[model samples]
Target: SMNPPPPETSNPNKPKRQTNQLQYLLRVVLKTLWKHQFAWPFQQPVDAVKLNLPDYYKIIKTPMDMGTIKKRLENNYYWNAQECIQDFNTMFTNCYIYNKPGDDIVLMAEALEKLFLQKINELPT
Candidate 1:
């Protein structure tokens, strides 16, 4: 049997092996984040309707969550490490924008953000 082939573009600095290494590091980071005590709220997308937050979608157009990130990673949706990190950035930013200061979830997001940075730096560049 025969079939048509496709093509792609853009040059990545590191070789495919390096990319795979990054994936391993990402997996470790995710596992650590998932195990965090403060990570429970962030594991899944916010349920605006159930939470009675009618303006949630209006405020945060791009909703990101840890569970969503896990799925994307498993499916190879990330092009580079920064892309995966950006999703975490978006999630924390959304949490900050939606929740008031001193709120429980806001505090959790802050702790998680700090832990994220620590783990990211630990990854070999």
Candidate 2:
């Protein structure tokens, strides 16, 4: 009351702000993955009807795609960076499960996964 209620010493929202910064780093990694040469196949959801693979959906119960993940990031659907990374893991796992071992799609998944992990390690704690 004496001197304009004194300036607040500590920031109450510091933790939330740090989380947002972590998310921003996550987003950059995602964008890097999107620009990778092998990113095409994983860019969008599998079209079971058009592709004529009826059993695709049955095999891949939890379909994940870059587009969907991007949307989720925008919507704040992930609680933290780990959740988003887990989605990428699921996306790659789905690829391995649906595509044959030597398939081109699987190869690309391997490449992207390698790059994804590398960039993830480079991120700050």
Candidate 3:
């Protein structure tokens, strides 16, 4: 569910071209990082194998379940850096109602960047 109005596509050839460029860049970066020798901290063994999508749905369905969320993170060791960035992107694009006027969304982006950096740094070098 994209928001803030889809980009104008009057120029028929531009949108897909631009999207392909961005996709190319993303793939390159991910591939480079994945090829790095060190193991990432988020690469911890998956735990709580019995936990399913229903459990995740229930955890996210409430506003005051931060503790539950944290517990799940700890129990499953399932902190996904890319997923966090995507979730933040969704919040910025579709959950603007939670943002105040003049708020800097870049702060959220920076925080997420820091989080990933920290996760990477936590890995054995």
Instruction: Tell me the whole-model lDDT of each prediction, alpha carbons only.
Output: 0.75, 0.73, 0.32
lDDT of 2 by residue, 42-87 (tens): 7777777667787886687787888767766655555567767878
lDDT (C-alpha) at residue 19 in model 3: 36
Ordered list by lDDT, greatest first: 1, 2, 3
Candidates arranged by TM-score, highest first = 1, 2, 3
Residue lDDT tens for model 3, 12-123: 3322222332332234323333344432311222122332323332333212112222223333322344432343244333323433455563444344444445544443
Q: Could you tell me which residue pairs clash in candidate 3?
A: none
The deviation in Å at residue 62 for candidate 1 is 0.9
Which stretches in model 1 have alpha-carbon errors above 4 Å?
A: 1-21
lDDT of 2 at 56: 80
- Per-residue lDDT of 1-125 in model 1, one digit per residue for the tens? 12112111223553343375457645788888999999887787787766778788778778888987876666566667887788889999999998899899998999999988898887765
> Which scores higher on TM-score, 2 or 3?
2
True-structure RMSD for candidate 3: 15.2
Regions of model 2 farther than 4 Å from truth: 1-21
